[PDB]
Design an enzyme around this catalytic site. Sequence first.
Site: not given
Length: 536
Positions: A252, A261, A389-391, A429, A432, A508, A513, A515
Amino acid sequence: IVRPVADFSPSLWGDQFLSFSIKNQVAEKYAKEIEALKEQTRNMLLATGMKLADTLNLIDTIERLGISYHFEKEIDDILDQIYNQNSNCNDLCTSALQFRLLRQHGFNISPEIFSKFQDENGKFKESLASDVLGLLNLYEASHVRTHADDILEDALAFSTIHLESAAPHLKSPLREQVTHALEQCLHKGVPRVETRFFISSIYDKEQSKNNVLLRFAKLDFNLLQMLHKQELAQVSRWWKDLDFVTTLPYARDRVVECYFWALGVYFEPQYSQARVMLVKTISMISIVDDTFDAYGTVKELEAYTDAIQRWDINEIDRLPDYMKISYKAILDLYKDYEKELSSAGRSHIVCHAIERMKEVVRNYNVESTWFIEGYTPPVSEYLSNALATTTYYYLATTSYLGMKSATEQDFEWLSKNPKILEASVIICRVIDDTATYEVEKSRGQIATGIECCMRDYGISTKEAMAKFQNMAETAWKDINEGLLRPTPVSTEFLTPILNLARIVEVTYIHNLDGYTHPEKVLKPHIINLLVDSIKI
């Protein structure tokens, strides 16, 4: 190796942000006038003998107009006085505004202030249903509660049903304000986004507006916007020179969305260096995500993960050519950070962000393993992997790098996963997961959150989504409690974590989604914050 075919939409912005030349004559004219208006406004705040209702309204207006970052000392002193005087003899409008402003600033005002508006059952008096300004302020207050505020359990439902009923017959711009509020509450919105709406759509159209405050808010918004455009031009050039658009075409291309962001995390001018550092990290970890999700083979992903754990340029040869590209860029980026933080003596804190990056990549690789094996973990095990893993642990840590006042002790607190951070991560989390369930389901992901929840508790999709919605509500109550004094670190280091949670809610909205698909949600926000100035 036959890789999957690419499916992401190209950047919808082209090169329109790449070059921005500031007009110094205009910027200096604006700055000069703002200094004058800033002092007039300070004197409005420091005026003696104001009534409580008038003082709260002045503060609320200055905050919504987006110019309160100029008056942090003055506003704090005033709210601290109000908190300690403990006044409980006002109407619903003034009481609810008092409660919200104090709680948002960390003052733990008791919710018993609302008891006089309820019956013996703890239900709000229905006779209040014709007081629209009272209901609007109660609605906004209902979003700032903690686990200790169950007296407000009914406030959202009550105010919502009666504002809905009243709205079509209200005068303007009150009608537009109420309608907007029911779509997006103030407390969970992105500050610049809410400010742009209030200035142009509401305050500019109020018959009773203060001309000094409105001119101040317009010039200040437009002057900060010039800085944001310079930063984005600088980041666009950086991205262009890396050229992942042509050497890594599977990924992307979203650097403008990444900048939005970073602008949501902080907008003030003193955080310019921090914003530019933060946006480069968001861009780079997004490339890694796409590599794990939609291009790399199992064997290639194992090598990538190990090389990241070792963090050593010697490891590149173990990697496929296309992976060499991103691995080198990552190592370079952190070397740039170290050099950039050098004259301030803060080079050593970069290791904190690096360790959080290694954690994200380890858990990306676990997620890949689960997918290939067809494993559906119980919810407890799912979350032990999927929260990172959401960062969001990584981004919160990164947000501190460019903050000159952040110390080793601040990083130490963050490293222990404090409650307020865990809550912001949980919100990202579960929202999403609710939004992306049906899509990932069609792509064969058996270890999606909603899937794990259904199999574990043995419930329907609808019931699983509702359980996830409850987890988000619990998490917001944890964030609100985490802002209350005494705080474990300065409030300056809590607000980025709150703002990360706000970005989730905005991105969201209406369960999509934003992004990966910026067209519906984010594109209007980017135009209003970074393309169009406010007309004066």
